């Protein structure tokens, strides 16, 4: 939830964070249906429902808190952790997949997962109103 910080007149909150977040929501869904219909079910392979569920909730939380800055970065930091774990899991899954085309797809989609997450953490930080957290040249 957003408090009462900055109101981006040019809509930078949506232009940057909204777009970056959307990329994650899309990538997550893309990979989810792709994994849940593929891979060899042998342990942590074939699906990572909890991992993806945790991510989406975080990205969607940023949507709700679009403009709070602090809550955005907080969730974005969780996003980075969640997605990196998801991608890493896929990396291992694809190593021992029965469909070496699917595994290739897997790591391609996993790339977008982490790539969009970096952009999300990028946008959440960039559009954090005024990022004077480390004495950013006060006058």
Curated annotation (Swiss-Prot):
The source's domain of life comes to Eukaryota
Q: What is the effect of changing residue 117 to V?
A: Reduces stability and binding to VCL with little effect on binding to APBB1IP
Q: What subcellular locations does the record give?
A: Cell projection, Ruffle membrane; Cytoplasm, Cytoskeleton; Cell surface; Cell junction, Focal adhesion
Helical bundle R3 as annotated region, ranges: 37-139
Question: What is known to happen upon mutating residue 83 to V?
Answer: Reduces stability and binding to VCL with little effect on binding to APBB1IP
* UniProt remark on domains: Consists of an N-terminal FERM domain linked via a short unstructured region to a large flexible C-terminal rod which contains 13 amphipathic helical bundles (R1-R13). The rod begins with a five-helix bundle (R1) followed by three four-helix bundles (R2-R4). These are followed by a series of eight five-helix bundles (R5-R7 and R9-R13) in which the N- and C-termini are positioned at opposite ends of the bundle, creating a linear chain. The four-helix bundle R8 does not disrupt the chain because it is inserted into a loop in the R7 five-helix bundle.
What role does this protein play? High molecular weight cytoskeletal protein concentrated at regions of cell-matrix and cell-cell contacts. Involved in connections of major cytoskeletal structures to the plasma membrane. With KANK1 co-organize the assembly of cortical microtubule stabilizing complexes (CMSCs) positioned to control microtubule-actin crosstalk at focal adhesions (FAs) rims.
> Subunit structure of this entry?
Part of a complex composed of THSD1, PTK2/FAK1, TLN1 and VCL. Interacts with THSD1; this promotes interaction with PTK2/FAK1 and VCL. Interacts with NRAP and LAYN. Interacts with SYNM. Interacts with ITGB1; the interaction is prevented by competitive binding of ITGB1BP1. Binds with high affinity to VCL and with low affinity to integrins. Interacts with APBB1IP; this inhibits VCL binding. Interacts with PTK2/FAK1. Interacts with PIP5K1C. Interacts with F-actin. Interacts with SVEP1.
Its protein name is Talin-1
Instruction: Write down the species.
Output: Mus musculus (Mouse)
* Parent-protein residues present: 755 to 889 of 2541
